[PDB]
Amino acid sequence: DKFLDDAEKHYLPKTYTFDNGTFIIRAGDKVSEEKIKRLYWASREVKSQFHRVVGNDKALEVGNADDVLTMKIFNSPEEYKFNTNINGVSTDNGGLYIEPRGTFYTYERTPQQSIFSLEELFRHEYTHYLQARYLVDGLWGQGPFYEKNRLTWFDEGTAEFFAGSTRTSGVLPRKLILGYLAKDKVDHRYSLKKTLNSGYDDSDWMFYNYGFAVAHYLYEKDMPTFIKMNKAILNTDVKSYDEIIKKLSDDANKNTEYQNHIQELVDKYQGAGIPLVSDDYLKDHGYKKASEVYSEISKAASLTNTSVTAEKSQYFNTFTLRGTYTGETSKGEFKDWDEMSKKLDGTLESLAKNSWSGYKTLTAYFTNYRVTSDNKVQYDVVFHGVLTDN
Numbered sequence: 001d002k003f004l005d006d007a008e009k010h011y012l013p014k015t016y017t018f019d020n021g022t023f024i025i026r027a028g029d030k031v032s033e034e035k036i037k038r039l040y041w042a043s044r045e046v047k048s049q050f051h052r053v054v055g056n057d058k059a060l061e062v063g064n065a066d067d068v069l070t071m072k073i074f075n076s077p078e079e080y081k082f083n084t085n086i087n088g089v090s091t092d093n094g095g096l097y098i099e100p101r102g103t104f105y106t107y108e109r110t111p112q113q114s115i116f117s118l119e120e121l122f123r124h125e126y127t128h129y130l131q132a133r134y135l136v137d138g139l140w141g142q143g144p145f146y147e148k149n150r151l152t153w154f155d156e157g158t159a160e161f162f163a164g165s166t167r168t169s170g171v172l173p174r175k176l177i178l179g180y181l182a183k184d185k186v187d188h189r190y191s192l193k194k195t196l197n198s199g200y201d202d203s204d205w206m207f208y209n210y211g212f213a214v215a216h217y218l219y220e221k222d223m224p225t226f227i228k229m230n231k232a233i234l235n236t237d238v239k240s241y242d243e244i245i246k247k248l249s250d251d252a253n254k255n256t257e258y259q260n261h262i263q264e265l266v267d268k269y270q271g272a273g274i275p276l277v278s279d280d281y282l283k284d285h286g287y288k289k290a291s292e293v294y295s296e297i298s299k300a301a302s303l304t305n306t307s308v309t310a311e312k313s314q315y316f317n318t319f320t321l322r323g324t325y326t327g328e329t330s331k332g333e334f335k336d337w338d339e340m341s342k343k344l345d346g347t348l349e350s351l352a353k354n355s356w357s358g359y360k361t362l363t364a365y366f367t368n369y370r371v372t373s374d375n376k377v378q379y380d381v382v383f384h385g386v387l388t389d390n
């Protein structure tokens with residue numbers, strides 16, 4: 001009805017466009033422009049870690065709604081409830097991502113109204129947008145991966161995981177998730193087998209946190225298994241996925257390794273951070289000639305066959321630089337991953353020691369692993385940052 005669009009204009013009067021129109025935020029008049037900018041840059045930190053782990057940055061299907069991501073942010077939990085009347089989806093949540101619409105619906109909130117800030121919640125839900133676009137073929141809720149609870153622990157656990165994405169230090173654990181784990185009685189911790197068979201029909205939802213613990217355990221202590229699992233999902237190889245799950249679930253030593261990892265996480269609760277974008281992203285960086293940015297980045301990261309695209313956003317322009325990295329002799333796909341991450345984070349941290357504050361906006365990932373005929377590690381490498389040269 002014209003009555004509903006009229007209401008929607010009133011509740012979401014502001015429109016902010018990023019990335020040549022592929023990332024749109026509509027927001028209430030009480031949502032600060034500062035917060036809008038933080039959410040854009042948060043998306044890039046999460047996107048970068050996700051593509052490093054998964055190894056793919058090409059949309060799986062052509063012409064889906066999520067070619068454009070739309071975020072709708074109501075002013076408050078109270079005005080959020082009008083979203084059910086307006087767009088016909090549930091508001092019994094802190095937010096909701098609807099894949100067929102490429103739309104995330106949520107609301108700004110005070111620390112008194114939720115434990116999770118808006119940026120922290122967005123970091124989690126944006127991970128679902130990434131899973132659906134770049135990892136899980138077909139629509140959410142369909143196909144073999146949406147039977148037998150196959151991906152329930154994974155989808156929620158990795159969303160909690162990737163919400164802890166940082167700029168230069170990989171993925172870090174979040175205080176709030178570690179707090180839930182720390183408050184559990186030790187002998188009520190989920191076994192590895194129980195976590196990998198948990199469902200949304202469960203009654204307690206602690207599985208989100210034990211699912212995170214699985215993801216973080218694999219990330220930190222068994223990255224080969226984590227890569228093989230993601231490759232199985234990416235290739236819709238149900239057989240390989242089920243074999244991995246069965247091997248993890250039936251091995252008593254793997255569960256003890258996982259239990260000990262939970263204890264390490266719990267021990268880290270007190271001093272754990274909440275990864276959120278730096279204020280550096282909001283500073284005025286000053287002019288820097290564009291080709292000097294590209295040249296300096298390409299040299300520090302030892303890239304060849306480089307290309308660059310520039311994109312327009314509400315408040316700034318950005319660039320995406322792509323190149324090929326060819327390193328030394330491969331120590332295998334999994335030991336290669338680890339050294340590539342260390343190299344890329346070191347390069348990002350070296351560039352940020354530069355006087356140009358614009359280098360503090362850089363995010364980077366690698367994808368499409370392969371070895372050369374000379375058995376040399378090779379990757380496509382992608383950098384993203386602000387561009388202050390019109």
Ligand SMILES: O=P(O)(O)c1nc2cc(Cl)c(Cl)cc2nc1P(=O)(O)O
Pocket residue numbers: 092093094095096097116120121124156160208
């Ligand atoms: O829909 P909600 O209610 O917005 C949701 N919000 C969450 C917020 C945080 Cl920050 C964390 Cl820790 C987990 C969450 N999981 C969900 P989910 O989509 O899987 O129900």
Ligand SMILES: O=P(O)(O)c1nc2cc(Cl)c(Cl)cc2nc1P(=O)(O)O
Pocket residue numbers: 167277278279280
């Ligand atoms: O992201 P933040 O949270 O903006 C950051 N702030 C810092 C503040 C000070 Cl005062 C010092 Cl000395 C170091 C910092 N390092 C960081 P970094 O990016 O390298 O983790």
Ligand SMILES: [Ca+2]
Pocket residue numbers: 131132133136137138139140
């Ligand atoms: Ca999908």
Ligand SMILES: [Zn+2]
Pocket residue numbers: 124125128155156159
């Ligand atoms: Zn979720």
